[PDB]
Short mmCIF file of C-alpha atoms (C1' of nucleotides) and ligand atoms in Angstrom, two decimals:
data_model
loop_
_atom_site.label_atom_id
_atom_site.label_comp_id
_atom_site.label_asym_id
_atom_site.label_seq_id
_atom_site.Cartn_x
_atom_site.Cartn_y
_atom_site.Cartn_z
CA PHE A 1 0.00 0.00 0.00
CA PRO A 2 1.58 3.31 -1.16
CA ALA A 3 1.21 4.89 2.25
CA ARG A 4 3.34 7.99 1.74
CA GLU A 5 1.75 8.89 -1.59
CA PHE A 6 -1.62 8.39 0.12
CA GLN A 7 -0.64 10.31 3.27
CA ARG A 8 1.08 13.25 1.62
CA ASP A 9 -1.93 13.58 -0.68
CA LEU A 10 -4.58 13.29 2.02
CA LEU A 11 -2.89 15.89 4.21
CA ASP A 12 -2.27 18.34 1.38
CA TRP A 13 -5.94 18.16 0.51
CA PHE A 14 -6.81 18.72 4.16
CA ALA A 15 -4.59 21.78 4.48
CA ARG A 16 -6.48 23.30 1.55
CA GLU A 17 -10.05 22.22 2.32
CA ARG A 18 -10.17 21.95 6.14
CA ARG A 19 -13.30 23.63 7.49
CA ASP A 20 -12.64 26.41 10.01
CA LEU A 21 -14.81 24.89 12.74
CA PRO A 22 -15.05 26.37 16.22
CA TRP A 23 -13.20 23.51 17.93
CA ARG A 24 -10.35 23.78 15.42
CA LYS A 25 -9.27 27.19 16.72
CA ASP A 26 -6.76 25.46 19.00
CA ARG A 27 -5.72 22.05 20.32
CA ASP A 28 -6.93 22.56 23.87
CA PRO A 29 -7.76 19.07 25.24
CA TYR A 30 -10.85 20.28 27.12
CA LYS A 31 -12.41 22.08 24.16
CA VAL A 32 -11.48 19.21 21.84
CA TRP A 33 -12.96 16.67 24.25
CA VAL A 34 -16.22 18.59 24.53
CA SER A 35 -16.54 18.78 20.75
CA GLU A 36 -15.77 15.11 20.23
CA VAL A 37 -18.49 14.12 22.73
CA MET A 38 -21.00 16.52 21.17
CA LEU A 39 -20.21 15.18 17.71
CA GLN A 40 -21.05 11.57 18.65
CA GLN A 41 -23.96 10.63 16.37
CA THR A 42 -24.62 14.36 15.86
CA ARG A 43 -23.91 16.41 12.74
CA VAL A 44 -21.29 19.18 12.79
CA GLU A 45 -23.89 21.76 11.75
CA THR A 46 -26.07 20.85 14.73
CA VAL A 47 -23.18 20.89 17.18
CA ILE A 48 -21.76 24.35 16.29
CA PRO A 49 -24.21 26.51 18.31
CA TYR A 50 -24.27 24.08 21.19
CA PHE A 51 -20.47 24.03 21.39
CA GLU A 52 -20.26 27.83 21.30
CA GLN A 53 -22.86 28.19 24.05
CA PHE A 54 -21.35 25.38 26.15
CA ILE A 55 -17.81 26.72 26.08
CA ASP A 56 -19.07 30.23 26.90
CA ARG A 57 -20.86 28.79 29.96
CA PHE A 58 -18.07 26.33 30.88
CA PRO A 59 -14.82 27.87 29.63
CA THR A 60 -12.46 25.39 31.28
CA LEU A 61 -12.54 21.83 32.56
CA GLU A 62 -12.73 23.18 36.12
CA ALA A 63 -15.73 25.32 35.30
CA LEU A 64 -17.49 22.27 33.90
CA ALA A 65 -16.59 20.09 36.84
CA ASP A 66 -17.78 22.74 39.33
CA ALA A 67 -21.13 23.28 37.64
CA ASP A 68 -24.44 21.87 38.85
CA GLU A 69 -25.67 18.82 36.94
CA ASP A 70 -28.89 20.63 36.05
CA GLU A 71 -26.96 23.52 34.48
CA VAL A 72 -24.87 21.17 32.37
CA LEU A 73 -27.89 19.21 31.24
CA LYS A 74 -29.67 22.41 30.24
CA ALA A 75 -26.62 23.29 28.12
CA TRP A 76 -27.20 19.92 26.35
CA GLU A 77 -30.95 20.36 26.01
CA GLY A 78 -32.09 19.20 22.57
CA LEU A 79 -28.76 17.67 21.53
CA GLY A 80 -29.90 14.11 22.22
CA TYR A 81 -28.19 11.09 23.80
CA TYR A 82 -28.04 12.83 27.13
CA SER A 83 -25.93 10.24 28.90
CA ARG A 84 -22.99 11.69 26.92
CA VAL A 85 -23.04 14.84 29.01
CA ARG A 86 -23.62 13.01 32.28
CA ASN A 87 -20.56 10.89 31.41
CA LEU A 88 -18.53 13.94 30.41
CA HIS A 89 -19.53 15.75 33.60
CA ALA A 90 -18.27 12.78 35.63
CA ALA A 91 -15.13 12.42 33.54
CA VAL A 92 -14.21 16.09 34.14
CA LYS A 93 -15.00 15.83 37.86
CA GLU A 94 -12.77 12.76 38.00
CA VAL A 95 -10.10 14.57 35.98
CA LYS A 96 -10.29 17.49 38.45
CA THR A 97 -10.42 15.32 41.62
CA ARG A 98 -7.91 12.67 40.53
CA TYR A 99 -5.64 14.46 38.05
CA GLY A 100 -5.82 18.09 39.27
CA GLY A 101 -7.51 19.31 36.08
CA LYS A 102 -5.01 18.01 33.50
CA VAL A 103 -6.62 15.78 30.88
CA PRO A 104 -4.74 12.47 31.07
CA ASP A 105 -2.48 11.93 28.08
CA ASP A 106 -2.33 8.19 28.86
CA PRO A 107 -4.76 6.26 26.63
CA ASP A 108 -5.68 3.72 29.28
CA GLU A 109 -6.20 6.34 31.95
CA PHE A 110 -8.07 8.61 29.52
CA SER A 111 -10.17 5.65 28.34
CA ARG A 112 -11.00 4.79 31.96
CA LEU A 113 -13.11 7.97 32.06
CA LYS A 114 -16.86 7.69 31.50
CA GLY A 115 -17.91 8.37 27.94
CA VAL A 116 -14.44 7.91 26.48
CA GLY A 117 -14.56 5.05 24.00
CA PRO A 118 -12.06 4.15 21.30
CA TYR A 119 -13.02 7.03 19.01
CA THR A 120 -12.82 9.68 21.72
CA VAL A 121 -9.47 8.38 23.02
CA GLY A 122 -7.95 8.66 19.56
CA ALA A 123 -9.55 11.96 18.63
CA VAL A 124 -8.65 13.86 21.75
CA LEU A 125 -5.23 12.42 22.47
CA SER A 126 -4.06 12.56 18.85
CA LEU A 127 -5.21 16.14 18.42
CA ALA A 128 -4.38 17.57 21.85
CA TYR A 129 -1.25 15.58 22.70
CA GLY A 130 0.02 13.99 19.47
CA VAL A 131 -0.64 10.44 20.74
CA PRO A 132 -0.81 8.13 17.67
CA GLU A 133 -4.13 6.41 18.59
CA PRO A 134 -6.67 5.80 15.81
CA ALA A 135 -9.88 7.86 15.75
CA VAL A 136 -12.34 5.70 13.80
CA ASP A 137 -15.78 7.24 13.44
CA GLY A 138 -18.40 6.71 10.77
CA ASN A 139 -16.51 8.94 8.35
CA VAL A 140 -13.31 6.91 8.74
CA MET A 141 -15.16 3.59 8.43
CA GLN A 142 -16.76 4.82 5.23
CA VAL A 143 -13.41 5.94 3.83
CA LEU A 144 -11.52 2.79 4.80
CA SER A 145 -14.29 0.40 3.75
CA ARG A 146 -14.08 1.94 0.28
CA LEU A 147 -10.31 2.29 0.08
CA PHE A 148 -9.57 -1.30 1.11
CA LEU A 149 -12.88 -2.73 -0.11
CA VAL A 150 -13.80 -3.98 3.36
CA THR A 151 -17.23 -5.64 3.23
CA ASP A 152 -17.57 -6.71 6.88
CA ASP A 153 -20.60 -5.37 8.68
CA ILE A 154 -19.51 -2.21 10.50
CA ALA A 155 -22.12 -2.84 13.18
CA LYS A 156 -19.77 -5.50 14.52
CA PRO A 157 -17.28 -4.37 17.16
CA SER A 158 -14.70 -6.61 15.45
CA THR A 159 -15.05 -4.65 12.21
CA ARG A 160 -14.19 -1.43 14.00
CA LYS A 161 -11.12 -3.17 15.45
CA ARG A 162 -10.02 -4.13 11.95
CA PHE A 163 -10.25 -0.51 10.81
CA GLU A 164 -8.28 0.55 13.87
CA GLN A 165 -5.49 -1.79 12.76
CA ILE A 166 -5.58 -0.45 9.20
CA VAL A 167 -5.16 3.08 10.56
CA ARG A 168 -2.14 1.96 12.57
CA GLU A 169 -0.69 0.47 9.37
CA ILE A 170 -1.26 3.53 7.16
CA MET A 171 -1.06 6.34 9.74
CA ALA A 172 1.47 9.18 9.77
CA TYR A 173 3.18 8.86 13.16
CA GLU A 174 4.82 12.19 12.28
CA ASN A 175 1.53 14.09 12.41
CA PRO A 176 -1.05 11.74 14.03
CA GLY A 177 -3.63 14.35 14.97
CA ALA A 178 -3.53 15.86 11.52
CA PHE A 179 -3.71 12.45 9.87
CA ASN A 180 -6.76 11.53 11.96
CA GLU A 181 -8.65 14.75 11.45
CA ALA A 182 -7.90 14.59 7.72
CA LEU A 183 -9.35 11.09 7.31
CA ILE A 184 -12.51 12.22 9.10
CA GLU A 185 -12.81 15.39 7.02
CA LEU A 186 -12.46 13.33 3.85
CA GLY A 187 -15.46 11.26 4.88
CA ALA A 188 -17.30 14.43 5.85
CA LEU A 189 -16.73 16.38 2.61
CA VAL A 190 -15.80 13.93 -0.18
CA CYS A 191 -16.32 10.25 0.64
CA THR A 192 -19.97 10.71 1.42
CA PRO A 193 -22.64 8.01 1.69
CA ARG A 194 -24.48 9.01 -1.49
CA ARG A 195 -22.86 10.24 -4.72
CA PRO A 196 -19.31 10.32 -3.30
CA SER A 197 -17.08 12.86 -5.07
CA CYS A 198 -14.59 10.27 -6.31
CA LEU A 199 -13.38 12.35 -9.24
CA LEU A 200 -12.57 15.31 -6.98
CA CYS A 201 -11.27 12.83 -4.45
CA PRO A 202 -7.60 13.32 -3.52
CA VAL A 203 -6.81 9.68 -2.69
CA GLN A 204 -8.85 8.33 -5.60
CA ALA A 205 -5.73 6.60 -6.92
CA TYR A 206 -5.67 4.26 -3.92
CA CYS A 207 -9.38 3.38 -3.78
CA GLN A 208 -10.17 -0.25 -4.53
CA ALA A 209 -13.87 0.60 -4.45
CA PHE A 210 -13.40 3.36 -7.03
CA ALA A 211 -11.72 1.06 -9.54
CA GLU A 212 -14.50 -1.51 -9.15
CA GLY A 213 -17.23 1.13 -9.38
CA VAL A 214 -18.83 0.01 -6.13
CA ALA A 215 -18.37 2.98 -3.81
CA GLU A 216 -22.12 3.61 -3.55
CA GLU A 217 -22.54 0.12 -2.01
CA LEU A 218 -20.10 0.56 0.91
CA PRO A 219 -19.74 0.26 3.83
CA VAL A 220 -21.89 -2.78 4.42
CA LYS A 221 -24.50 -2.34 7.16
CA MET A 222 -27.54 -4.42 8.13
CA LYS A 223 -30.83 -2.55 7.73
CA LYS A 224 -32.21 -1.22 11.02
CA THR A 225 -34.93 -3.12 12.85
CA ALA A 226 -38.38 -1.56 12.95
CA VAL A 227 -38.87 0.08 16.35
CA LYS A 228 -41.34 -0.34 19.19
CA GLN A 229 -44.36 1.99 19.41
CA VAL A 230 -45.09 3.25 22.93
CA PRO A 231 -48.21 5.22 23.95
CA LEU A 232 -47.55 7.89 26.55
CA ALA A 233 -50.09 9.91 28.46
CA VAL A 234 -48.84 13.29 29.65
CA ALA A 235 -50.51 15.59 32.15
CA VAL A 236 -50.03 19.35 32.10
CA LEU A 237 -51.23 20.39 35.56
CA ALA A 238 -51.55 24.07 36.47
CA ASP A 239 -52.73 25.61 39.72
CA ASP A 240 -54.67 28.88 40.07
CA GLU A 241 -51.39 30.82 40.29
CA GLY A 242 -50.00 29.52 36.98
CA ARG A 243 -47.44 27.09 38.41
CA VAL A 244 -47.05 23.73 36.74
CA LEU A 245 -46.18 20.32 38.08
CA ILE A 246 -43.01 18.81 36.60
CA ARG A 247 -40.81 15.93 37.70
CA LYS A 248 -37.19 14.85 37.25
CA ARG A 249 -36.66 11.47 35.59
CA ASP A 250 -34.47 8.98 37.41
CA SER A 251 -30.82 8.78 36.47
CA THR A 252 -31.35 5.29 35.02
CA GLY A 253 -32.04 4.75 31.36
CA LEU A 254 -34.21 6.76 28.99
CA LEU A 255 -33.79 10.55 29.12
CA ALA A 256 -32.02 10.23 32.45
CA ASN A 257 -32.21 13.21 34.83
CA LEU A 258 -34.22 15.35 32.40
CA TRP A 259 -37.38 17.10 33.52
CA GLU A 260 -40.80 16.24 32.15
CA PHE A 261 -44.46 16.68 32.55
CA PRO A 262 -45.80 13.73 34.56
CA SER A 263 -46.50 10.84 32.23
CA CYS A 264 -47.59 7.22 32.31
CA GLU A 265 -46.65 4.65 29.73
CA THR A 266 -49.98 3.16 28.74
CA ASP A 267 -50.62 0.06 26.66
CA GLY A 268 -53.10 2.13 24.70
CA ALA A 269 -55.51 1.33 27.53
CA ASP A 270 -57.30 3.81 29.80
CA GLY A 271 -54.79 6.62 29.54
CA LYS A 272 -56.62 9.43 31.28
CA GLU A 273 -57.47 6.97 34.07
CA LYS A 274 -53.88 5.76 34.35
CA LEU A 275 -52.69 9.38 34.66
CA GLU A 276 -55.19 10.32 37.38
CA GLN A 277 -54.23 7.19 39.33
CA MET A 278 -50.53 7.96 38.84
CA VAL A 279 -50.67 11.44 40.34
CA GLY A 280 -52.90 10.55 43.29
CA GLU A 281 -50.34 7.96 44.38
CA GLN A 282 -47.28 10.25 44.35
CA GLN A 283 -55.67 16.06 44.16
CA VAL A 284 -56.20 16.55 40.40
CA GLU A 285 -58.89 16.28 37.70
CA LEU A 286 -58.05 15.92 33.99
CA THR A 287 -60.10 17.12 31.02
CA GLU A 288 -60.25 15.70 27.50
CA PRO A 289 -56.99 15.48 25.57
CA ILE A 290 -55.92 18.45 23.52
CA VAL A 291 -53.43 16.89 21.10
CA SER A 292 -51.78 13.62 20.04
CA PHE A 293 -48.37 13.54 18.35
CA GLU A 294 -45.46 11.16 17.79
CA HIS A 295 -41.84 11.56 18.78
CA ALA A 296 -39.01 9.38 17.43
CA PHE A 297 -36.08 7.92 19.28
CA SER A 298 -33.57 5.65 17.62
CA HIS A 299 -35.05 2.59 19.25
CA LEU A 300 -38.72 3.46 19.87
CA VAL A 301 -41.47 5.92 19.01
CA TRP A 302 -43.47 7.68 21.69
CA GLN A 303 -47.12 8.26 20.82
CA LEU A 304 -48.00 11.15 23.09
CA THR A 305 -51.41 12.39 24.19
CA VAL A 306 -51.61 15.57 26.26
CA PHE A 307 -54.25 16.00 28.93
CA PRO A 308 -54.78 19.38 30.58
CA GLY A 309 -55.73 19.30 34.25
CA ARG A 310 -56.17 21.52 37.28
CA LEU A 311 -53.96 21.27 40.37
CA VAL A 312 -55.19 21.75 43.96
CA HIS A 313 -52.51 21.59 46.66
CA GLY A 314 -53.18 19.15 49.48
CA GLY A 315 -49.66 18.56 50.76
CA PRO A 316 -45.98 19.17 50.15
CA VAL A 317 -44.74 18.75 46.61
CA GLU A 318 -42.39 15.82 47.17
CA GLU A 319 -39.37 14.74 45.09
CA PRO A 320 -39.00 13.94 42.23
CA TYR A 321 -41.73 16.52 41.55
CA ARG A 322 -41.29 20.29 41.52
CA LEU A 323 -43.91 23.03 41.31
CA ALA A 324 -42.59 25.44 38.70
CA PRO A 325 -43.99 28.86 37.86
CA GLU A 326 -44.40 29.23 34.11
CA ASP A 327 -41.69 31.89 34.08
CA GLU A 328 -39.17 29.37 35.48
CA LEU A 329 -39.89 26.41 33.19
CA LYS A 330 -37.16 27.77 30.90
CA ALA A 331 -34.67 26.92 33.64
CA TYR A 332 -35.14 23.17 33.35
CA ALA A 333 -33.82 20.84 30.68
CA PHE A 334 -36.70 19.10 28.92
CA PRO A 335 -36.61 16.48 26.17
CA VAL A 336 -37.78 17.77 22.81
CA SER A 337 -40.96 15.68 23.14
CA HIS A 338 -41.99 17.52 26.30
CA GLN A 339 -40.91 20.87 24.87
CA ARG A 340 -43.54 20.17 22.27
CA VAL A 341 -46.08 19.08 24.91
CA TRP A 342 -45.67 22.50 26.49
CA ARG A 343 -45.86 24.31 23.15
CA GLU A 344 -49.08 22.47 22.26
CA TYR A 345 -50.47 23.22 25.70
CA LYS A 346 -49.77 26.93 25.23
CA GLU A 347 -51.12 27.03 21.68
CA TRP A 348 -54.36 25.41 22.87
CA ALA A 349 -54.54 27.76 25.84
CA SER A 350 -54.62 30.81 23.50
"C1'" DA B 1 -23.04 -9.20 20.27
"C1'" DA B 2 -26.47 -6.31 19.87
"C1'" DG B 3 -30.03 -3.34 22.17
"C1'" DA B 4 -30.39 1.06 24.57
"C1'" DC B 5 -29.74 5.50 23.92
"C1'" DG B 6 -32.16 11.67 20.84
"C1'" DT B 7 -32.42 14.42 17.44
"C1'" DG B 8 -32.68 17.01 12.91
"C1'" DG B 9 -31.83 16.98 8.27
"C1'" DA B 10 -31.41 15.00 3.66
"C1'" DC B 11 -33.15 12.13 0.52
"C1'" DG C 1 -41.17 6.38 4.59
"C1'" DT C 2 -35.06 5.42 5.04
"C1'" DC C 3 -30.59 6.84 6.31
"C1'" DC C 4 -27.26 8.88 8.93
"C1'" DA C 5 -24.19 12.07 12.10
"C1'" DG C 6 -20.26 6.56 19.34
"C1'" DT C 7 -20.49 4.32 24.09
"C1'" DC C 8 -22.39 1.53 27.82
"C1'" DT C 9 -24.42 -2.54 29.03
S1 LIG D 1 -12.87 7.67 -4.79
FE1 LIG D 1 -15.05 7.85 -4.09
S2 LIG D 1 -15.38 6.00 -2.82
FE2 LIG D 1 -13.13 6.18 -3.10
S3 LIG D 1 -12.44 7.31 -1.26
FE3 LIG D 1 -12.83 8.86 -2.88
S4 LIG D 1 -15.00 9.52 -2.60
FE4 LIG D 1 -14.72 7.61 -1.38
CA1 LIG D 2 -13.14 3.65 27.60
CA1 LIG D 3 -19.70 11.22 6.40
CA1 LIG D 4 -35.38 4.13 35.61
#
DNA sequence: AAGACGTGGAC
DNA sequence: GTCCAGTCT
């Protein structure tokens, strides 16, 4: 494999075409690490405003570590896959507590941190510290599957390990961070899933898939399974003084530690009744439902139905619930589904 | 291994 | 509608 003629060419292309993204302003390990977590299964264009806002709020690792969990989650509100930021928050706290605020440059110690998998180890340490670890994301797997005509299913962990070995074989130990970011940028800008720009492509000469005319069929990936449908009844409960009842989800599993309007997973069966029974347990009367809408997750679809109701206080509002004046709802981090619940509630109200 | 785990944007 | 931008369990 003509590594040098591939490398020199990839990196020259990158020097010319590299996007001036916010996290490329410097090689600060904290800012890099934040961006690499935010970018997990999230497009660059989506990340940009979140990254800018997050770094303004949490300018250093210490700032992030010292912040309240609710503040950090609100900074992630709407980005999706919220355990990323809970893991990052813990990883920074551990980096502060254990390492005094210096991001480990040891791969095993960096990898020991929550949220830091093989991609994030390679991305951060190669960029920040020059450590020659591979940084294999979807872009890289697309590029390598085409270059070396690798047909193994990339859903398999073992496939990713094969790509990691290829990177180690063709890397540029001279400039590891720049090699890694260049391979990713190639997949971002050129070696795209549909209609890849093979003719423009710098490393076209080395592409087995190009020769064979099969780039549009790679990488190989098993079609996704159809997802579960889940009915969800949601109560929007306001008292005479405009405050609304919300509750914090447990830290285990779906939308962990986010706030929501109280909801009961129904089986499509007696929703309004299930909601009234749910609140009584942990005084309230619900009207007819005002809207029904769906909300997609990667692995299930919520079918939401919103029931207005009136709240009469008969005791202390006990955890996990909170009585929030309308003007303070904006302080809490809500999943997009419940942001829409509230929007629909307000539209109906008017 | 393979399901859990969000969301928006482009086909 | 499908596809697509990592890590924990
Ligand atoms: S020639 Fe086409 S398929 Fe091959 S690396 Fe370039 S863009 Fe991807
Ligand atoms: Ca790890
Ligand atoms: Ca890509
Ligand atoms: Ca739970």
